Amino acid sequence: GLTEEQRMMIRELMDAQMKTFDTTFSHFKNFRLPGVEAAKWSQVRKDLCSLKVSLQLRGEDGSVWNYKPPADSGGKEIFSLLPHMADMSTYMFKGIISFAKVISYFRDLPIEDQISLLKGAAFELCQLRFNTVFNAETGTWECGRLSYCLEDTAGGFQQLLLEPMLKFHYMLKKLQLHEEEYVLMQAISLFSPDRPGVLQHRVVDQLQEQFAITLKSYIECNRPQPAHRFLFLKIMAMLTELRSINAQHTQRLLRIQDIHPFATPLMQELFGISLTERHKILHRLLQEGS
Amino acid sequence: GLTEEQRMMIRELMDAQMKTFDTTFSHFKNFRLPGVLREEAAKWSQVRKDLCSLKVSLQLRGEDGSVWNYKPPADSGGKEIFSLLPHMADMSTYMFKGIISFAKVISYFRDLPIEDQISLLKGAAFELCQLRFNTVFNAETGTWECGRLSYCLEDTAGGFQQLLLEPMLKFHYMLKKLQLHEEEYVLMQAISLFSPDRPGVLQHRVVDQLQEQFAITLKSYIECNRPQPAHRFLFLKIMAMLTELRSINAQHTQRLLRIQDIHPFATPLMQELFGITSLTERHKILHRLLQE
Numbered sequence: 001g002l003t004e005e006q007r008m009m010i011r012e013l014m015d016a017q018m019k020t021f022d023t024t025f026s027h028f029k030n031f032r033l034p035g036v037e038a039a040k041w042s043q044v045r046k047d048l049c050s051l052k053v054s055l056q057l058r059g060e061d062g063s064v065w066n067y068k069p070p071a072d073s074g075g076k077e078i079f080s081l082l083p084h085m086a087d088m089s090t091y092m093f094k095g096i097i098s099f100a101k102v103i104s105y106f107r108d109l110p111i112e113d114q115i116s117l118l119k120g121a122a123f124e125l126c127q128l129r130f131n132t133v134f135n136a137e138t139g140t141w142e143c144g145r146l147s148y149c150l151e152d153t154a155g156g157f158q159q160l161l162l163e164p165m166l167k168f169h170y171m172l173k174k175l176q177l178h179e180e181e182y183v184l185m186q187a188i189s190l191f192s193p194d195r196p197g198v199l200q201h202r203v204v205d206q207l208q209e210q211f212a213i214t215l216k217s218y219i220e221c222n223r224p225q226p227a228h229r230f231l232f233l234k235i236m237a238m239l240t241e242l243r244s245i246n247a248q249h250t251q252r253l254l255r256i257q258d259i260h261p262f263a264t265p266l267m268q269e270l271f272g273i274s275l276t277e278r279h280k281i282l283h284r285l286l287q288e289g290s
Numbered sequence: 291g292l293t294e295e296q297r298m299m300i301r302e303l304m305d306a307q308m309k310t311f312d313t314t315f316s317h318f319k320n321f322r323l324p325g326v327l328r329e330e331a332a333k334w335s336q337v338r339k340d341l342c343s344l345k346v347s348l349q350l351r352g353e354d355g356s357v358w359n360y361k362p363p364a365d366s367g368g369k370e371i372f373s374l375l376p377h378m379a380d381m382s383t384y385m386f387k388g389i390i391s392f393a394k395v396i397s398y399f400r401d402l403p404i405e406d407q408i409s410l411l412k413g414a415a416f417e418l419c420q421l422r423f424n425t426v427f428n429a430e431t432g433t434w435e436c437g438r439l440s441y442c443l444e445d446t447a448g449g450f451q452q453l454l455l456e457p458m459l460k461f462h463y464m465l466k467k468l469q470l471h472e473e474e475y476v477l478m479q480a481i482s483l484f485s486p487d488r489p490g491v492l493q494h495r496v497v498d499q500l501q502e503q504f505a506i507t508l509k510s511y512i513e514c515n516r517p518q519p520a521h522r523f524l525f526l527k528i529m530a531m532l533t534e535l536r537s538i539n540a541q542h543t544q545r546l547l548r549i550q551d552i553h554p555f556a557t558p559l560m561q562e563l564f565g566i567t568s569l570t571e572r573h574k575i576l577h578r579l580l581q582e
């Protein structure tokens with residue numbers, strides 16, 4: 001029940017996702033691992049305690065390495081997983097950049113608007129991809145050999161749900177979205193006309209409307225159950241909440257970087273720590289081939 | 291009580307143990323860890339059998355409070371069965387160096403020909419290491435507590451019964467049940483070290499006499515420092531454990547040689563101790579270690 005222009009849009013996005021989402025994380029290697037002014041710290045310790053995960057590294061041989069993090073005994077021990085987290089995030093950001101590069105509507109845009117769109121949506125598209133590997137029953141992101149498990153708390157669900165990034169994950173997972181709906185959410189978030197720096201506002205706004213129309217038409221053609229009533233509007237509301245979480249995450253990251261520098265060079269360009277001149281890695285990655 | 295020469299014998303051995311047994315393993319660093327990655331096929335079948343016993347998980351408690359844990363892989367095609375061998379060799383070599391230092395600080399051992407010192411260390415190195423490992427063994431948790439490192443036996447099947455089939459696990463459990471004192475542990479080490487019937491020993495009667503005096507001291511220590519109508523046969527129980535330990539030593543040498551043939555892993559010190567390719571010129575690391 002979709003137009004062939006909508007049908008080609010969906011499969012160009014789904015082919016893009018297949019080519020640029022390493023769902024098994026097989027090509028992620030050479031990552032750092034945990035080893036074997038006063039007012040600021042209180043905020044930073046809060047920002048990092050709400051995201052207390054354990055790491056499981058499985059080997060092709062069948063062996064398993066497990067890392068339980070250090071409990072809060074003050075400081076410098078709260079930054080144990082930060083180097084690894086910056087390596088994984090940079091790897092995901094590169095996959096997001098490659099995702100946008102192979103989409104025709106994105107590469108046909110000015111390189112400065114391509115930089116502005118990727119700076120505003122990198123975190124958001126990374127969360128959408130991570131939701132597809134999130135296990136809500138075990139609170140674990142299953143990333144191939146790497147698994148990230150939320151540490152059990154006495155609060156019990158309620159405490160974790162006070163973290164907005166976690167409740168987004170549990171609520172988006174509850175919608176039980178298809179692959180096509182996640183990749184249309186990625187396109188709608190990527191082609192955001194009101195991101196800082198964007199110049200071709202109308203061009204991007206017109207592109208965003210077509211993606212949103214395609215998603216509404218896809219849902220109408222494949223999800224007629226009462227469980228999926230108002231699903232399109234729920235997804236659009238979820239995307240609005242994701243934009244709010246994105247702004248919070250940028251503020252958290254800048255606060256941690258000020259007291260403990262950890263960001264990779266690509267994260268510094270994406271989070272603001274001649275656009276093309278200030279964003280050389282992004283400029284090089286976007287001129288490179290897919 | 292004990293004769294004055296017997297008390298000084300225990301004091302030299304205790305002084306030996308204190309100076310050379312890193313009971314917290316604080317100085318065991320820079321060790322390798324498992325990574326995050328026709329007729330010879332009859333040799334491979336024997337080695338698979340040789341390496342199933344070593345179902346141990348490794349735990350690394352960090353200074354910050356973090357914990358790293360390692361489940362060994364299940365035997366598949368092969369090679370993964372050798373994942374813990376580099377680490378185990380580093381630990382064995384570290385323990386072997388502490389055993390050589392123990393023998394070096396004993397007067398009765400230094401006054402022997404260097405070639406008999408080497409022959410005794412080649413025959414008893416594994417046994418003295420197991421005796422020291424028993425003192426850090428927790429029978430209730432099946433875990434060797436080596437400071438920040440822990441080696442926990444993985445529940446293979448039934449459990450206690452299936453594990454007690456491996457002679458070395460049985461040894462650790464039976465020896466731990468005797469609840470020996472530090473002085474009795476160190477006297478076991480001396481009796482095992484001064485064994486006259488080790489391959490290559492020449493001064494057999496001097497070594498045999500030295501072993502008898504250590505055994506008499508241990509027998510006298512038990513009669514004078516333990517409730518006697520209860521520990522009547524503890525000395526004889528200890529001697530039977532040492533006899534079984536000598537048998538387990540020979541099984542381990544054969545197991546180790548079989549693995550080394552198809553998968554070399556032994557450190558240079560292990561190669562000299564286990565005969566992997568005159569006595570002075572073939573044992574030069576041991577020679578330097580015994581002559582500082």
Ligand SMILES: CCCCCCN(c1ccc(C(O)(C(F)(F)F)C(F)(F)F)cc1)S(=O)(=O)c1ccccc1
Pocket residue numbers: 051052053081082085086088089126127130141148165249252253256
């Ligand atoms: C540290 C808690 C991880 C889970 C919490 C939510 N996730 C997240 C985590 C950290 C960031 C950081 O930017 C921050 F500084 F905020 F910690 C980073 F630098 F550490 F990476 C961003 C998103 S997650 O994407 O789902 C994700 C990321 C890596 C592995 C699995 C899942």
Ligand SMILES: CCCCCCN(c1ccc(C(O)(C(F)(F)F)C(F)(F)F)cc1)S(=O)(=O)c1ccccc1
Pocket residue numbers: 340341343344375378379381382420423434441458459542545546549
């Ligand atoms: C295969 C024999 C198993 C005997 C019981 C297990 N132990 C053991 C394991 C391997 C060896 C080897 O010699 C072998 F060749 F068998 F593989 C070594 F080279 F790997 F180190 C020796 C003793 S342990 O004493 O309890 C020990 C050693 C180091 C750290 C913690 C515990």
